[PDB]
Amino acid sequence: KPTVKEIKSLQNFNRIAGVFHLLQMLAVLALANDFALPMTGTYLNGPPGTTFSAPVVILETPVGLAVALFLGLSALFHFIVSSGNFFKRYSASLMKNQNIFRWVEYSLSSSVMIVLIAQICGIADIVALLAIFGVNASMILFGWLQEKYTQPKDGDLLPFWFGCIAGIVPWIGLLIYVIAPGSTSDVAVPGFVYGIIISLFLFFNSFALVQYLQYKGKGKWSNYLRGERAYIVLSLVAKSALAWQIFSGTLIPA
Amino acid sequence: PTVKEIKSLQNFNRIAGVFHLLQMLAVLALANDFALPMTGTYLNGPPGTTFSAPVVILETPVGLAVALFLGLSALFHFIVSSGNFFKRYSASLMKNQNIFRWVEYSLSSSVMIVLIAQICGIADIVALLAIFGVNASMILFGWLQEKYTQPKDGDLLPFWFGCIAGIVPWIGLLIYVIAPGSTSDVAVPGFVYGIIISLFLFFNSFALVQYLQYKGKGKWSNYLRGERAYIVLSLVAKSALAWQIFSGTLIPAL
Numbered sequence: 184k185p186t187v188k189e190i191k192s193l194q195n196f197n198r199i200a201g202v203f204h205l206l207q208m209l210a211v212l213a214l215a216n217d218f219a220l221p222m223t224g225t226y227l228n229g230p231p232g233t234t235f236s237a238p239v240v241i242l243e244t245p246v247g248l249a250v251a252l253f254l255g256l257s258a259l260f261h262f263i264v265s266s267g268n269f270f271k272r273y274s275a276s277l278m279k280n281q282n283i284f285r286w287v288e289y290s291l292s293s294s295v296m297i298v299l300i301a302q303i304c305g306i307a308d309i310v311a312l313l314a315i316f317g318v319n320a321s322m323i324l325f326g327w328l329q330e331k332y333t334q335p336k337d338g339d340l341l342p343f344w345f346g347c348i349a350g351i352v353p354w355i356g357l358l359i360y361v362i363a364p365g366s367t368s369d370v371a372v373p374g375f376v377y378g379i380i381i382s383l384f385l386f387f388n389s390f391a392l393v394q395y396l397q398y399k400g401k402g403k404w405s406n407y408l409r410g411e412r413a414y415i416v417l418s419l420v421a422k423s424a425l426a427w428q429i430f431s432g433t434l435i436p437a
Numbered sequence: 438p439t440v441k442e443i444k445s446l447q448n449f450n451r452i453a454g455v456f457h458l459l460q461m462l463a464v465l466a467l468a469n470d471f472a473l474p475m476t477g478t479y480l481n482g483p484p485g486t487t488f489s490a491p492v493v494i495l496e497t498p499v500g501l502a503v504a505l506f507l508g509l510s511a512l513f514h515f516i517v518s519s520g521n522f523f524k525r526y527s528a529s530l531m532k533n534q535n536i537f538r539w540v541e542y543s544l545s546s547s548v549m550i551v552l553i554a555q556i557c558g559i560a561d562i563v564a565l566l567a568i569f570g571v572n573a574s575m576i577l578f579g580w581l582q583e584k585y586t587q588p589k590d591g592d593l594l595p596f597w598f599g600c601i602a603g604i605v606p607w608i609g610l611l612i613y614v615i616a617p618g619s620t621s622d623v624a625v626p627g628f629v630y631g632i633i634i635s636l637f638l639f640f641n642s643f644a645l646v647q648y649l650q651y652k653g654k655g656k657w658s659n660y661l662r663g664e665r666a667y668i669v670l671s672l673v674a675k676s677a678l679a680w681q682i683f684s685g686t687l688i689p690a691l
């Protein structure tokens with residue numbers, strides 16, 4: 184049973200994560216250049232099975248603003264959950280092995296992040312980016328249903344496994360683009376792009392491992408609160424790591 | 438529900454199987470070798486600079502892909518109609534569940550929406566992969582609605598998640614038919630509009646069946662009515678798409 188001291192400590196950690204992300208959000212908004220990545224349409228120039236027009240730019244992702252957005256969403260929800268006003272709802276949810284505000288935040292913030300990673304890899308088709316956003320959101324919503332309908336140690340991981348099936352799809356997409364089957368150019372994928380894909384792939388797998396460990400509920404993971412803390416650590420570090428790598432790689436003259 | 442009522446649904450599954458198997462044969466025998474490309478449009482400079490011309494990675498053999506969604510339907514309709522599955526089928530129906538329906542739909546409806554996307558000129562391989570994944574996710578949410586909720590309990594959360602995932606490919610189609618930023622106003626063929634509009638209505642009809650079942654008002658309080666509606670919709674939707682694709686693209690000798 185989660186005590187009042189334990190919940191209050193978790194609220195404090197949420198607040199700390201919020202301040203880190205809010206300050207990083209300010210730093211990116213202030214310091215970032217106007218680097219932009221295109222969303223494109225490559226339209227038929229006749230009936231299906233004929234030829235295509237050249238890709239056209241439909242809109243440009245303002246990368247600095249998009250990084251600020253996933254940091255800002257994190258700050259907002261970490262601050263909401265940390266509030267004394269929310270202690271009762273937070274306590275009640277943790278008692279039921281749930282944190283719904285976590286999934287609401289992740290469904291938006293992690294989806295912004297994987298779209299930015301896709302664009303940094305050169306994925307530009309607007310339907311590719313929309314469907315990556317949608318399938319990544321679906322991964323999060325499956326994790327939400329795992330918490331809503333199961334309890335740790337009840338032997339039921341079906342929603343979790345559905346989440347893994349949805350969750351892996353964007354990463355298969357990235358792997359296809361970095362392999363670049365049929366490519367004519369001899370240009371290498373930049374080192375900093377490999378850094379982003381590999382480090383954030385590891386972070387995304389870490390989130391899945393937290394839910395798996397929580398719902399297996401073996402050893403120290405029998406205590407749901409250990410997973411709650413792990414999620415805060417992973418969201419703090421994953422978001423800060425992606426923001427810094429995008430900033431360092433694309434948003435400064437250096 | 439009466440044993441007779443279930444034997445009846447067994448019979449209806451068999452009838453649907455025979456129609457789809459015969460249509461599968463007809464398409465395999467009669468269809469031309471019409472193919473739709475899956476493309477990669479790779480960076481040929483650092484992120485935020487230049488792209489190579491799109492390259493064709495592979496070609497969807499449209500006749501074989503139509504035969505595949507008809508064949509998947511025939512296979513699962515035959516599996517569930519078997520006297521050897523009558524216990525497992527009856528048992529699941531008794532619990533307001535049909536897992537074999539969702540397993541089939543997760544593959545067959547995903548092949549269908551990818552084909553519709555390609556007919557609309559969506560070609561980027563990540564667009565088509567992520568459309569497959571988000572459409573499969575829509576089906577898996579429908580499965581979780583049946584697994585975890587009871588009709589009339591007021592809980593449609595998995596259903597609404599399925600709607601969020603489910604609408605994403607259709608927003609994609611709408612973007613490609615509007616073709617924002619296009620250099621010219623290239624006409625979408627009438628038969629393509631027929632396919633998008635008819636199958637959008639069919640896809641909405643599937644969602645309405647689950648909604649009606651879990652609201653559980655009127656005759657829809659009887660789960661077997663929805664089981665029957667799903668068989669009718671999968672029979673008609675698949676036959677309608679197969680005929681429209683065949684008539685639109687698979688007739689002329691190439």
Ligand SMILES: CCCCCCCC/C=C/CCCCCCCC(=O)OC[C@H](O)CO
Nearest residue numbers: 625626627628629630631632635673677681
């Ligand atoms: C419940 C009953 C289920 C019944 C199943 C529903 C079938 C839907 C068929 C729609 C065909 C719509 C018309 C498609 C052909 C349009 C031809 C056209 O208008 O051509 C324009 C041309 O491209 C420029 O000149």
Ligand SMILES: CCCCCCCC/C=C\CCCCCCCC(=O)OC[C@H](O)CO
Nearest residue numbers: 604607608610611614615616622633634637
């Ligand atoms: C709540 C959000 C709902 C939004 C998601 C709904 C998606 C509808 C998709 C297909 C329906 C059929 C589409 C037929 C309408 C096509 C529009 C059109 O005809 O435009 C041509 C264009 O201007 C070039 O000339």
Ligand SMILES: *C/C=C(C)/C=C/C=C(C)/C=C/C1=C(C)CCCC1(C)C
Nearest residue numbers: 293323326346347350387390391394
């Ligand atoms: C800023 C927050 C981030 C990056 C959160 C990421 C979360 C995930 C990658 C979650 C993954 C999960 C699965 C792959 C399976 C189901 C359980 C989840 C939702 C934890």
Ligand SMILES: *C/C=C(C)/C=C/C=C(C)/C=C/C1=C(C)CCCC1(C)C
Nearest residue numbers: 546576579599600603640643644647
């Ligand atoms: C051949 C079989 C087909 C075309 C099946 C299609 C099924 C759907 C479009 C299902 C849609 C659903 C939702 C949009 C929400 C959740 C419930 C579903 C799975 C019935």
Ligand SMILES: CCCCCCCC/C=C/CCCCCCCC(=O)O
Nearest residue numbers: 627628630631634635638639642673
């Ligand atoms: C049996 C379940 C009911 C599902 C509804 C689907 C059937 C109704 C179909 C309507 C198709 C309308 C298509 C009109 C397209 C013409 C436009 C054009 O040619 O430009």
Ligand SMILES: CCCCCCCCCCCCCCCCCCCC
Nearest residue numbers: 347350351354384387388391392395
């Ligand atoms: C990158 C986003 C999608 C990730 C999907 C894959 C996540 C897998 C991580 C959790 C699964 C762990 C399975 C463990 C099986 C081995 C035996 C466990 C020992 C207790």
Ligand SMILES: CCCCCCCCCCCCCCCCCCCC
Nearest residue numbers: 338339340341344345347348351388
């Ligand atoms: C709990 C029931 C026991 C059955 C578990 C087996 C089901 C596995 C489902 C596979 C779907 C996962 C897809 C993603 C895997 C990719 C791994 C790469 C990540 C490093």
Ligand SMILES: CCCCCCCCCCCCCCCCCCCC
Nearest residue numbers: 494495496497498551562565566569
């Ligand atoms: C010229 C190529 C020869 C024929 C290949 C046709 C097969 C296409 C399959 C490629 C799949 C790419 C991603 C989109 C669909 C995803 C479906 C797979 C999930 C199980």
Ligand SMILES: CCCCCCCCCCCCCCCCCCCC
Nearest residue numbers: 600603604607637640641644645648
């Ligand atoms: C195209 C695939 C995705 C479809 C998503 C949308 C499906 C919506 C259809 C079912 C929902 C109906 C909601 C009814 C609104 C209120 C009506 C009151 C009567 C109970």
